[PDB]
Design a binder for this molecule. Structure first.
Ligand SMILES: *O[C@H]1[C@@H](OC)[C@H](n2cnc3c(=O)[nH]c(N)nc32)O[C@@H]1COP(=O)(O)OP(=O)(O)OP(=O)(O)OC[C@H]1O[C@@H]([n+]2cn(C)c3c(=O)[nH]c(N)nc32)[C@H](O)[C@@H]1O
Lengths: 358, 736, 13, 17, 103, 741
RNA sequence: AGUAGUAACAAGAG
RNA sequence: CUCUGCU
């Protein structure tokens, strides 16, 4: 645990809630005013979220999922599924978004377990994760620490505060606006070995007093569902072609890279990625949906899905008609307020409109 | 005795005494569900939360005496605290693991018997056979199937009565088992369930599952029997089919139904062949039902069906020339009839389209408790002589004959709520619906049918609507014989090239025309093992696979169509499609499409790959010259006429230009590779026979014209015609 | 199968 | 002897009273 | 199954404005016979209330407008791409061991 | 190189990849704090759409009521609650004409349901407002409280067991001049009795409880839902029964059918419209919800529809069907918890109940709440706001879809009397309408006619979020149709993972969910294997049931390791006992106990499947091998799973937070009730399997059964003379206890 | 502080 | 000092 020091009592919001008293005992208080229900103050989009997504779509040399062993395959369909699952696991285990899935799931499950078991004490929770490097080694890695505060979580929306301290090699000075909520300390020097030689680099510690709700932790533990949202879609995009060709096209799609889908935009135009790139991109999208989940994301996703259907009808020469398009746009735009993920999705949708009607 | 002691203790407590005394047995159903706790809205979150506390589980108080409070490691298995809202105490999962580890073992030989259904699943999966997996454009249709076949002989109520007998013999009440099946199953179950400590409630629930039939609407693609539905996830997929044969015995009814379906599909497909007998023989020798070859099931399955009979005749097996209807086996002793659909209005002001049999004919009706001789004309019961053993059997035979007559008063006798479409709006069989309705109640039918004067016909006393025998009066054309008149003989027959079955004398016994036109679903998965695997599939599958085959072979199909289209049209791969094309319109559609193809060939440019794909299947049949103009081509699909539009985009046949992909009935069929020689340039020249499509109208050659009347144009002149989805276009009668 | 595509996070120190 | 190969519908009849 | 007392008053009050009693409304609706009331009302309604269809062409959809406040800041519970990890060769295994002793 | 997942739609059509547009991996947006603001906003909005109606004051409850029926015709496209009685009656008449006898047959079916429906039917349903406690209670608990109060008040006509008798008692209660209830106050437990006047009981019998819909996806802003009292639900059940009977007879009404029944019915109907449409006719399909549908479906129009439907029926049947719309037209909406006021300078919290908003000063509120309170103050009465117009989260979904389908049928060419015509599908507030007309102008004219007719009937199409395209692709109740329904797996993602019933039920449910998704939602086999692996991992972590051979440390690890060493056949161990996972695509339909039965050790098999283990607890048959699952969209679903009852079929701890509240007595009463019921089952084993019957008290039935059982056991020799003597003496003692009292 | 967003948590009841 | 973590 962690002695309840002044610094932890402040960072974890100890005794910050007002005392709950009967209304008749405080009706005469001068500034007794209803809670503040002001509209979230809107913010702007920044390139850092796009860089975060770009990295989440990257390939890592270390495997991140070690799945249990299912019953031995007997049916020929089971063998085909096993081969396809081998391809999917090879493509996904090395995805950075899979690392995000694992670290988030571990953090959320540890936080919830500590929250339930130790509801009065500040608990130290290391940020651990497990990978298998491409040489078979099974390195156990530490990302930092989480000091969970008091966790008398009554409602599913009740908040437990925790101080998160993460190591990093990125100087916040470069992009201060991204780290408005962090107090970053320079705590070490890391002698990184590179191709030319060795370079000495500072090592910082991003510290912030974050918070999480019981429902948020519960959905964090189930971040592995993202793996399905992506992989199922990929399978749905493979099976269709395999039905058309009357053959199993998993090998052709993964090894031969015959089929590519428009997956990104560069200055040269639209870039086409293979099935693996598309799988990683969808996995990253689902992972970020889980990480940056919020009512803004849900509302924008629904309304933009409706607009996507309209644009698809336009693309299919179904001469779509609208009764109030400006109303639909206003409904969509009302869901873009603060969350960087939703703003990035809105910019993505704008780009897709630009490249879809040209 | 423990329970009476507990009752005495409860009466001792004042408040519990008041509850017990005041509340009645009827009011128990209400206070039994009296709970302060509310259903958890997100149980997953609560469970994740509660697995972190020490004692999330609740167990009976007795646990405290039959499990140590802590194990050798000191971890507290259970606690003293009492569960909220009950007398159960709190317990940790450690307690459960401890019980499974070093707990009091007992005998479990009874478990397979009480959980018979689950262990039957295990056993029939153990002995199942796995064939190759085939990647095909699977077309799954949503339809009601059975997940629990139940004990067919026993209706739900009989199953409940048997369950009460077996599990709660004293609480049966006044009920007594009458059906012999009830007695035998009750006996065997009681013998098996001897000294079964399992909770009676669980035994009752498992027996309900085992005995009571349960159905479910599920998207399926193979057999609809339970043995195939439970493994539906394993067998049928989006793009693949896993040929699987569940082990164990198979219900004879399911095999009979699947054989009927397979025979119907094979004969319907074989009619459109150039050599129907040889084609039918090949599909019989290449088809398997439920993993069993179809060649060797006919010689061992006597199910009566004009299609089954045609198949048997093709193999030299003696046929019966009989067919089931309303539970009675009908054998046409004399007469002949022709099928033709016709619309009728029922007595409940509902409009039906029923298949009337034109022609005088005579049948012999054989039933389990009745036998009759019938003579009928078109929607007219000329005569009926019944010989039922009891009044109920006589009434059943009379009602079946009445419905089989298809008489107008029969149709107009419908009263009350009778629906001819299920909750999925699928068209039910009108004859079966009428049979069910009239068997439920027949007073109106007999009242509205008519009475005929009857003389003293020896041993043929008349019957009246009230079911009492009468001598002077009787139901029109209905007599009851006491001679117990009571066909099965299998007469050897010769079947010609065109599947016309003739006996020794030479009269046509069976022909493909009288084969049923319904497209039913097999109870057992049917596998076809030729090069084109989809010959005997349903309508949607045939359409999708035909267009997919055209797409795949498009490289050679183009060249064959350009230099030798007659052989392209001959291509057998289009025959099942033609089987879907109505017989009446087959020749005219073929002629129209062939003329359009020839004009497309003659006209320089104007090549349209998508149009050729759309219209090629219709060209298989021999041409029939005509001047009629077709706005759409019709194909039969489960009793509905799907209209493939000649010009434009329709749900049946779609070409997405953005993806350059063709979808049929919502199922992808592939993409068409870009053809530099297409060059549509607006002008199509492959829509109207003898007309060229200039394009958008210009309102100078005429306001608009209809497709059919447009034939008035002689030659050369240009006019505006309303062709397509409200898109008037300019056209001209081709120079030649 | 080795995935491919056409270390400040996890360096060697 | 006399047997029904396949009997559809509910059967019976309420007319008998 | 009668309606009387309090339910009678509630029924009387729960009627269209012109009617005054439940039995009167029942008599009116029982004798009701369609006579083109819907068409007459459709004629009466102003022409402005209509479901005008504006075609959605390739030039119809404008780009979405994003808020123009201060740039959005990181809100994830942990660093995503900037996170640095201190690891060890120790193979051990996932879920095995004491995370603190590993840390 | 900026990767953009949305650009995937440039190649894959939106529908085929619609699953990507669902963020359901993340947590749904929950509601924090009170729902009083949302309820006030709903009441004000409902009264705003009907402001041009007639204002009256109820003579019984004394609350102001607003009647928009036959109000001024709409002059703008905004939602309007001015429904025309003539137009709705005309729509119903034409529905009857086009479907002869539908009303008559439906009325007879409802007649038989009403005859054969018992009070116990009201036990189904959840979170039913309990007027006796002014809070939401389980439907069975609220029903029991209401029955007890009625009995204490002399309403002793409900013991017949028939629902209609209970409704008669409900009316008799409202007609009573006074009422007596029992409430607990702690200051020590005090079973106080409260006397309610006629007007107060009337207000609290028409009251509608309100809360905030939690875990609702696709909406940025939260909305308030409502649950009715016990008096209302009785008539609501019959009304819904009749409306559902009518709906089953309508081709365009897909609400009663659900799941794959719903999808098949919709597919068939859309196919029929595409078929019967003329080839030369231009065809279009409109997708849209109806804006403020619940707020505008006036209950007076529902009364008119019921009265028309019940034409020529027995007067008592008309009464039984028409009572519910009457009560709803005079309904009241509870505000809710209230608000929370904070003082930063003094740093204190307080919660102000919603009952004291009719008098509290307005300076304590922010602007929005200030104006909502100002606008709703006239409607506030005894802590509830009068909500006569509109239908706040009404349960008349069946009746509403009947009205929608009636308007939908109004589009037949025999009714339009023009070239254009329309049909489609209706379900609650959602509709998919197909228009066929020779030209685009005809399509537009038909669209305008349908929209204006809906405005006439009170249905307001949402032009904001509805769009029209060429027939062939559309959307309906989150079902995306693209020339054929496409599987949208993202909807079923939340169902995956640990359900949280118990170890056995949760394994069975997980494997069954994977299998069902393979069958229905196009879950490929490799993805199925993935889902199985991930579910097993999550199951093991949640239940601390990792394999014994593993070194993972958990409070259950020691016992699992000991069991692992104990067993000879490791493969036979269940996953809950550290055994390996033998599941695969082959055997997703087989319960684990049966799958591993042959591999189980004999002693382990006996211990696991010991019927006398204390962990297994069995309630009535209706709660056996079944679970309630909540999908991302739609109401609760009853999912049945195949599971062998073993020691793992235990019950999780029950929320004890009621122990430190004034209402603990209800919990105590529940305990005692169970103590009695379980003993009744000890005397009548079939009570659980099928509901028992009788009029005598439980004690009489049990003692008579004990006596007869003793005599039979003696005759069979199962008990000796002394045992029979003791049983008889105890029975006589029980008789004396009952007599003395 | 911080979570979060139209109202709340930052423990609550004895 | 006791109780509760969906009441
Ligand atoms: O499930 C289908 C069918 O198998 C697919 C099944 N079935 C048929 N036979 C058996 C059987 O022997 N054993 C089992 N277990 N199942 C059997 O029952 C269903 C059959 O109905 P369906 O396929 O939906 O349509 P259809 O085959 O046409 O049945 P139905 O319309 O009731 O007619 C049955 C026979 O009656 C002939 N028929 C009717 N009329 C009025 C006449 C007539 O006036 N003259 C003549 N010559 N024949 C008539 C029908 O043509 C059909 O042959």
């Amino acid at each position: 645990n962690m002695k309840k020091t002044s610094q932890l009592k402040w960072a974890l919001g100890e005794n910050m809630a007002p005392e709950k008293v009967d209304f008749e005992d405080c009706k005469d208080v001068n500034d007794l005013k209803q809670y503040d229900s002001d509209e979230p103050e809107p913010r702007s989009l920044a390139c850092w979220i796009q860089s975060e997504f770009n990295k989440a779509c990257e390939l890592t040399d270390s495997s991140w999922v070690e799945l249990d062993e299912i019953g031995e395959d007997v049916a020929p369909i089971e063998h085909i599924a096993s081969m396809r699952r081998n391809y999917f696991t090879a493509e996904v285990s090395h995805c950075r978004a899979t690392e995000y899935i694992m670290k988030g799931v571990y953090i959320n499950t540890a936080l919830l377990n500590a929250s339930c078991a130790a509801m009065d004490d500040f608990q130290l929770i290391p940020m651990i994760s497990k990978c298998r490097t491409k040489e078979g080694r099974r390195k156990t890695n530490l990302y930092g620490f989480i000091i969970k505060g008091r966790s008398h979580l009554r409602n599913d929306t009740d908040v437990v505060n925790f101080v998160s301290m993460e190591f990093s090699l990125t100087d916040p000075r470069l992009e201060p606006h991204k780290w408005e909520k962090y107090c970053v300390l320079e705590i070490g020097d890391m002698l990184l070995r590179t191709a030319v030689g060795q370079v000495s680099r500072p090592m910082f510690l991003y510290v912030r007093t974050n918070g999480t709700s019981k429902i948020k932790m519960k959905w964090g533990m189930e971040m592995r569902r993202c793996l399905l949202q992506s992989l199922q879609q990929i399978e749905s995009m493979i099976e269709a072609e395999s039905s058309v060709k009357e053959k199993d096209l998993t090998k052709e799609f993964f090894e031969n890279k015959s089929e590519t889908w428009p997956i990104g935009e560069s200055p040269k135009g639209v870039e086409e990625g293979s099935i693996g790139k598309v799988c990683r991109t969808l996995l990253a999208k689902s992972v970020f949906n889980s990480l940056y989940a919020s009512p803004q994301l849900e509302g924008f996703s629904a309304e933009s899905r409706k607009l996507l259907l309209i644009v698809q009808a336009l693309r299919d020469n179904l001469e779509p008609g609208t009764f109030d398009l400006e109303g639909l746009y206003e409904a969509i735009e009302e869901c873009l307020i603060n969350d960087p993920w939703v703003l990035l999705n809105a910019s993505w949708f704008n780009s897709f409109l630009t490249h879809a009607l040209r | 005795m423990e329970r009476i002691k507990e009752l005495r203790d409860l009466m001792s407590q004042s408040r519990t005494r008041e509850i017990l005394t005041k509340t009645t047995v009827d009011h128990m159903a209400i206070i039994k569900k009296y709970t302060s706790g509310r259903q958890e809205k997100n149980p997953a979150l609560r469970m994740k939360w509660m697995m972190a506390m020490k004692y999330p589980i609740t167990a009976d108080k007795r646990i405290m005496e039959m499990i140590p409070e802590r194990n050798e490691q000191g971890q507290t298995l259970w606690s003293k605290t009492n569960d909220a809202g009950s007398d159960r105490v709190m317990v940790s999962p450690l307690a459960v693991t401890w019980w499974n580890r070093n707990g009091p073992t007992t005998s479990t030989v009874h478990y397979p018997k009480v959980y018979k259904t689950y262990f039957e699943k295990v056993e029939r999966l153990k002995h199942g056979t796995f064939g190759p997996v085939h990647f095909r454009n699977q077309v799954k249709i949503r339809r009601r199937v059975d997940i629990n076949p139940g004990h067919a002989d026993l209706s739900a109520k009989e199953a409940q009565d048997v369950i009460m007998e077996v599990v709660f013999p004293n609480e049966v009440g006044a009920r007594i088992l009458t059906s012999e099946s009830q007695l035998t199953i009750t006996k065997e179950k009681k013998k098996e369930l001897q000294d079964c400590k399992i909770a009676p409630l669980m035994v009752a629930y498992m027996l309900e599952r085992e005995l009571v039939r349960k159905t479910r609407f599920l998207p399926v693609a193979g057999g609809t029997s339970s043995v195939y539905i439970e493994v539906l996830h394993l067998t049928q997929g989006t793009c693949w089919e896993q040929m699987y044969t569940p082990g164990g015995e198979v219900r004879n009814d399911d095999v009979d139904q699947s054989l009927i379906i397979a025979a119907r599909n094979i004969v319907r497909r074989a009619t459109v062949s150039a050599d129907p007998l040889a084609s039918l023989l090949e599909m019989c020798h290449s088809t398997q039902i439920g993993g069993v070859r179809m060649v060797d099931i006919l010689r061992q399955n006597p199910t009566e069906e004009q299609a089954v009979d045609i198949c048997k005749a093709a193999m030299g097996l003696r046929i019966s020339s009989s067919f089931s209807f309303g539970g009675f086996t009908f054998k046409r002793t004399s007469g002949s009839s022709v099928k033709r659909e016709e619309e009728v209005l029922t007595g409940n002001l509902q409009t039906l389209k029923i298949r009337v049999h034109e022609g005088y004919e005579e049948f012999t009706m054989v039933g389990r408790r009745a036998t009759a001789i019938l003579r009928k004309a078109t929607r007219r019961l000329i005569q009926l002589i019944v010989s039922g053993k009891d009044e109920q059997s006589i009434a059943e035979a009379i009602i079946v004959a009445m419905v089989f007559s298809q008489e107008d008063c029969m149709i107009k006798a419908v009263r009350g709520d009778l629906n001819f479409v299920n909750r999925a709006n699928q068209r039910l069989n009108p004859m079966h619906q009428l049979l069910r309705h009239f068997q439920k109640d027949a007073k109106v039918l007999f009242q509205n049918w008519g009475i005929e004067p009857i003389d003293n016909v020896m041993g043929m006393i008349g019957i009246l609507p009230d079911m009492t025998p009468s001598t002077e009066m009787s139901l029109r054309g209905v007599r009851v014989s006491k001679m117990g008149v009571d066909s099965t003989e299998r007469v050897v027959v010769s079947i010609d090239r065109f599947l016309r079955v003739r006996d020794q004398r030479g009269n046509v016994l069976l022909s493909p025309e009288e084969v049923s036109e319904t497209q039913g679903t097999e109870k057992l998965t049917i596998t076809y093992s030729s090069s084109m695997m989809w010959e005997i599939n349903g309508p949607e599958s045939v359409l999708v696979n035909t267009y997919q085959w055209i797409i795949r072979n498009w490289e050679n199909v183009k060249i064959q169509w350009s230099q030798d289209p007659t052989m392209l049209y001959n291509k057998m791969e289009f025959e099942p499609f033609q089987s879907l094309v109505p017989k009446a319109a087959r020749g005219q559609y073929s002629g129209f499409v062939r003329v359009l193809f020839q004009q497309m060939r003659d006209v320089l440019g104007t090549f349209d790959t998508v149009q050729i794909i759309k219209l090629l299947p219709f060209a298989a049949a021999p041409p029939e010259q005509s001047r009629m103009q077709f706005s759409s081509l019709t194909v039969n699909v489960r009793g509905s006429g799907m209209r493939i539009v000649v010009r434009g985009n329709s749900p049946v046949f779609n070409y997405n230009k953005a993806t350059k992909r063709l979808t049929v009935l919502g199922k992808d069929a592939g993409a068409l590779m870009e053809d530099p020689d297409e060059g549509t340039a607006g002008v199509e020249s492959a829509v109207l026979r003898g007309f060229l499509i200039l394009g958008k109208e210009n309102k100078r050659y005429g306001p608009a014209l209809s497709i059919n009347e447009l034939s008035n144009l002689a030659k050369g002149e240009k006019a505006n015609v309303l062709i397509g989805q409200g898109d008037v276009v300019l056209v001209m009668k081709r120079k030649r | 199968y080795s995935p491919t595509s056409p270390s400040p996070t996890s360096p060697s120190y | 002897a006399a047997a029904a190969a396949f009997a559809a519908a509910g059967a019976a009849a309420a007319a008998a009273a | 199954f009668e309606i009387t007392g309090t339910m009678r008053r509630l029924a009387d009050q729960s009627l269209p404005p012109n009617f005054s009693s439940l039995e009167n409304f029942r008599a009116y609706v029982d004798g009701f016979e369609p006579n083109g009331c819907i068409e007459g009302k459709l004629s009466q309604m102003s022409k402005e209330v209509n479901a005008r269809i504006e075609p959605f062409l390739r030039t119809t959809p404008r780009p979405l407008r994003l808020p123009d406040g201060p740039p959005c800041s990181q809100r994830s519970k942990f660093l995503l791409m900037d996170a640095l990890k201190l690891s060890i060769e120790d193979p051990s295994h996932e879920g095995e061991g004491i995370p603190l002793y590993d840390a | 190189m900026d990767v953009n997942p949305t650009l995937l739609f440039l190649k894959v059509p939106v529908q085929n990849a619609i699953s990507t547009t669902f963020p359901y991996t993340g947590d749904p947006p929950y509601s924090h704090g009170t729902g009083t603001g949302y309820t006030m906003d709903t009441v004000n909005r409902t009264h705003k759409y009907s402001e041009k109606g007639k204002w009256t004051t109820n003579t019984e409850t004394g609350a102001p009521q607003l009647n928009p029926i036959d109000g001024p015709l709409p002059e703008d496209n905004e939602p309007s609650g001015y429904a025309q009685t003539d137009c709705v009656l005309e729509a119903m008449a034409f529905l009857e004409e086009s479907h002869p006898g539908i009303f008559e047959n439906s009325c007879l079916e409802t007649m038989e349901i009403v005859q054969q429906t018992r009070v116990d039917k009201l036990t189904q349903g959840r979170q039913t407002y309990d007027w006796t406690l002014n809070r939401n209670q389980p439907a069975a608990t609220a029903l029991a409280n209401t029955i007890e109060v009625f009995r204490s008040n002399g309403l002793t006509a409900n013991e017949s067991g028939r629902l209609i008798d209970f409704l008669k008692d409900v009316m008799d209660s409202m007609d009573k001049e006074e009422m007596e209830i029992t409430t607990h106050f702690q200051r020590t437990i005090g079973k106080k009795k409260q006397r309610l006047n006629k007007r107060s009981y009337l207000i609290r019998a028409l009251t509608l409880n309100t809360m905030t819909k939690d875990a609702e996806r696709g909406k940025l802003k939260r909305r308030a839902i409502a649950t009715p009292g016990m008096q209302i639900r009785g008539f609501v059940y019959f009304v819904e029964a009749l409306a559902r009977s009518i709906c089953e007879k309508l081709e365009q009404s897909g609400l009663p059918v659900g799941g794959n029944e719903k999808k098949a019915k919709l597919a068939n109907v859309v196919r029929k419209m595409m078929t019967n449409s003329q080839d030369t006719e231009l065809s279009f399909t409109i997708t849209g919800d109806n804006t403020k549908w619940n707020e505008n479906q006036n209950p007076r129009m529902f009364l008119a529809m019921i009265t028309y439907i019940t034409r020529n029926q027995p007067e008592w049947f008309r009464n039984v069907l028409s009572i519910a719309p009457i009560m709803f037209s005079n309904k009241m909406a509870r505000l809710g918890k209230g608000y929370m006021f904070e003082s930063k300078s003094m740093k204190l919290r307080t919660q102000v109940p919603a009952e004291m908003l009719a008098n509290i000063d307005l300076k304590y509120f922010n602007k929005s709440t200030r104006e909502k309170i100002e606008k709703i103050r006239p409607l506030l009465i005894d802590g509830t706001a009068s909500l006569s117009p509109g239908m706040m989260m009404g349960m008349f979904n069946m009746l509403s879809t009947v009205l929608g389908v009636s308007i939908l049928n109004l589009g037949q060419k025999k009714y339009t009397k023009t070239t254009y015509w329309w049909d489609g599908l209706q379900s609650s507030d959602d509709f998919a309408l197909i228009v066929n007309a020779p030209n685009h102008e005809g399509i537009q004219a038909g669209v305008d006619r349908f929209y204006r007719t809906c405005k006439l009937v009170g249905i307001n199409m949402s032009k904001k979020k509805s769009y029209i395209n060429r027939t062939g692709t559309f959307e309906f109740t989150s079902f995306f149709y693209r020339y054929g329904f496409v599987a949208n797996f993202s909807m079923e993602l939340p169902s995956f993972g640990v359900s949280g019933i118990n170890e056995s039920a949760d394994m069975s449910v997980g494997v069954t969910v994977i299998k069902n998704n393979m069958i229905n939602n196009d879950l490929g086999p490799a993805t199925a294997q993935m889902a199985l692996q991930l579910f097993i991992k999550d199951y093991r972590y949640t239940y601390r049931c990792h394999r014994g051979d593993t070194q993972i440390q958990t409070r259950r690890a020691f016992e699992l390791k000991k069991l692992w060493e104990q067993t000879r056949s490791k493969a036979g161990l269940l996953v809950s006992d550290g055994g390996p996972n033998l599941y695969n695509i082959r055997n997703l339909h087989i319960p684990e106990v049966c799958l591993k039965w042959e591999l189980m050790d004999e002693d382990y098999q006996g211990r696991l499947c010991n019927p006398m283990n204390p962990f297994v607890s069995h309630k009535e048959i209706d709660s056996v091998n079944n679970a309630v699952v909540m999908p991302a969209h739609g109401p609760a679903k009853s999912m049945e799973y195949d599971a062998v009852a073993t020691t793992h079929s235990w019950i999780p701890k029950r929320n004890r937070s009621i122990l430190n509240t004034s209402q603990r007595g209800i919990l105590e009463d529940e305990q005692m009730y169970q103590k009695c019921c379980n003993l009744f089952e000890k005397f009548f084993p079939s009570s659980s399997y099928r509901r028992p019957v009788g009029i005598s008290s439980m004690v009489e039935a049990m003692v008579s059964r004990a006596r007869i059982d003793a005599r039979i056991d003696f005759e069979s020799g199962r008990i000796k003379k002394e045992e029979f003597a003791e049983i008889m003496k105890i029975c006589s003692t029980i008789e004396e206890l009952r007599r003395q009292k």
